[PDB]
Amino acid sequence: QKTYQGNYGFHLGFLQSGTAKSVMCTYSPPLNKLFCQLAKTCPVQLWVSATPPAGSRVRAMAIYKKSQHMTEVVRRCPHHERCSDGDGLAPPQHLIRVEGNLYPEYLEDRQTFRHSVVVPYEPPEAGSEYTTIHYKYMCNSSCMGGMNRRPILTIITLEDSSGNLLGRDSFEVRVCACPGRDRRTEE
Numbered sequence: 001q002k003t004y005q006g007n008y009g010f011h012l013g014f015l016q017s018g019t020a021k022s023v024m025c026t027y028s029p030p031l032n033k034l035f036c037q038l039a040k041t042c043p044v045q046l047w048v049s050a051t052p053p054a055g056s057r058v059r060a061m062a063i064y065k066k067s068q069h070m071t072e073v074v075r076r077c078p079h080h081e082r083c084s085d086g087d088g089l090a091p092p093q094h095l096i097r098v099e100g101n102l103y104p105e106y107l108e109d110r111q112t113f114r115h116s117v118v119v120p121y122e123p124p125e126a127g128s129e130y131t132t133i134h135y136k137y138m139c140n141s142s143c144m145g146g147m148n149r150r151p152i153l154t155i156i157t158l159e160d161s162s163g164n165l166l167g168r169d170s171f172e173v174r175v176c177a178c179p180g181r182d183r184r185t186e187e
């Protein structure tokens with residue numbers, strides 16, 4: 001999917017990680033793909049060249065990468081939906097959760113029924129040029145009844161207070177047992 005830096009030069013950044021066998025989450029620049037273990041926090045950096053207007057929001061939504069599956073709402077498999085691992089904020093069917101943020105909004109589009117999680121957009125801390133949001137994936141890419149080995153992307157959208165698009169970026173994601181090994185193979 002096309003990126004849209006927009007008027008605020010919005011784009012994503014990822015901490016440099018290796019491919020050690022025990023790594024828990026690692027990003028591949030050449031594949032623009034995140035490899036992470038089930039439910040493991042993934043810090044994602046939000047970079048801007050200019051400060052978005054007050055009240056802006058940041059939405060994270062998952063979609064299937066392949067054209068033939070793109071219309072299907074990405075959700076957790078029946079097993080995980082029922083495993084009772086909710087934090088009391090995220091609906092049990094949501095694949096993507098946010099952690100370390102007091103204001104997450106778990107939404108479901110009235111028309112597409114697609115799930116997404118929004119947090120307020122906040123400027124970078126003191127002595128920092130980016131803002132970090134921590135995401136976690138509650139299902140494995142291999143989950144039958146769920147993603148069922150189908151690769152997905154995590155569309156991150158900067159929107160204004162009215163929900164208008166300000167910027168957009170994305171990255172592919174693979175939730176697996178050994179991110180380090182899988183990253184190496186796919187590369």
Ligand SMILES: [Zn+2]
Pocket residue numbers: 076077079080138139140143146
């Ligand atoms: Zn699952």
